[PDB]
Amino acid sequence: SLLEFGKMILEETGKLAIPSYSSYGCYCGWGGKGTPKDATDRCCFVHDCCYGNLPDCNPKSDRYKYKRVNGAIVCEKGTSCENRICECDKAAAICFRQNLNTYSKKYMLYPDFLCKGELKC
Ligand SMILES: CN(C)Cc1c[nH]c2c(CCCO)cccc12
Incomplete structure (x- = not known):
């Protein structure tokens, strides 16, 4: 659920x-169109696509458990939707950490009309 995804992001970055990540670029937040603005936005695009592979799951409200093995994020065994949601979130969090160096505040509250073009998952 968003509760876990949020904690994961704070811990990582x-x-x-x-x-920081709810209105960033074209895909971090509501976002569902155009070309990702940068690496961080690409993390959100891939994250959206990951959720897209789970039509009968509810990633925003479905809660899962995860632990930290010294750095490493380890998703704990839950229902199959919970396990797959967690893997999607874990990936996004790492992708965010990996691109912290290029995060630009000029992409926060990014305007909708500038999200142009198209990209299939
Ligand atoms: C009520 N409320 C705050 C819902 C909400 C907060 N952050 C969200 C993100 C951020 C995911 C982008 O990385 C995506 C989708 C929905 C939400």
């Missing part, structure tokens, strides 16, 4: 999900 030191930034709070809202508002």
Whole structure:
């Protein structure tokens, strides 16, 4: 659920999900169109696509458990939807950490009309 995804992001990057990653670029947040603006936005695009592979799951409200083995994020065994949601979130969190160096505040509250073009998952 968003509760877990948020904690995961804070732990990884030191930034709070809202508002560092809730209105960033074209895909971090509501976002569903155009070309991702940068690497961080690409993390959100892939994350959206990952959720897209689970039509009968509810990633926003479905809660899962995960532990930290010294750095490493380890998804704990739950229902199959829970396990797959967790893997999607874990990947996004790592992708965010990996691209912290290029995160630009000029992409926060990014305008909708500038999200142009198209990209299939
Ligand atoms: C009520 N509320 C705050 C819902 C909400 C907060 N952050 C969200 C993200 C962020 C995911 C982008 O990385 C995606 C989809 C929904 C939400």
